[PDB]
């Protein structure tokens, strides 16, 4: 279209969220429980040590 | 504006009627009564002749 301002609004309507950023959000959310468990068991071991 | 289709619609809103065409309409409308009178008196003279 020759309408200025149509590209990105159509792009934005096409792509609410970019796939790479969405997958980054997915992997970071999946990784969080593992990091929580690792830190928690590490603190448990340190407290058990004393 | 970068909006395509804005020129002529703004031009059209600006110029409902072009001045040259409007004056042509004015002068032709003014001239019509004179031509009517000339033809009418000419026909009157021709009928009077016979």
How are the elements arranged and paired?
This is part of a larger assembly, with two copies of chain A (50 residues).
Chain A: H1 7-14, H2 19-49
Number of helices of chain A: 2
> Helix share of residues of chain A?
over 70%
Give the largest interface.
A-B, 3 and 3 residues
Instruction: Profile the largest sheet of chain A.
Output: none
PDB class: membrane protein
Keywords: connexin, gap junction channel
Entry title: Connexin-43 gap junction channel in complex with mefloquine
Chains A, B: Gap junction alpha-1 protein
Record keyword descriptors for this entry.
part of a larger assembly; 2 chains; 50 residues; mainly alpha; 0% strand; membrane protein; connexin; gap junction channel
Q: Can you give a write-up of this model?
A:
- This is part of a larger assembly, with 2 copies of chain A (50 residues).
- Chain A is an all-alpha fold and 50 residues long.
- Helix content of chain A is 78%, strand content 0%.
- Chain A is built from 2 helices and no strands.
- Chain A has helices spanning 7-14, 19-49.
- The termini of chain A are far apart.
- At the A-B interface, loops of A face loops of B.
């Amino acid at each position: 279209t020759q309408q200025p301002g149509c590209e990105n609004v159509c792009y934005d309507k096409s792509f609410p969220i970019s796939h790479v950023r969405f997958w980054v959000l997915q992997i970071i959310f999946v990784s969080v429980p593992t990091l929580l468990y690792l830190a928690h068991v590490f603190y448990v071991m340190r407290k058990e040590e004393k």
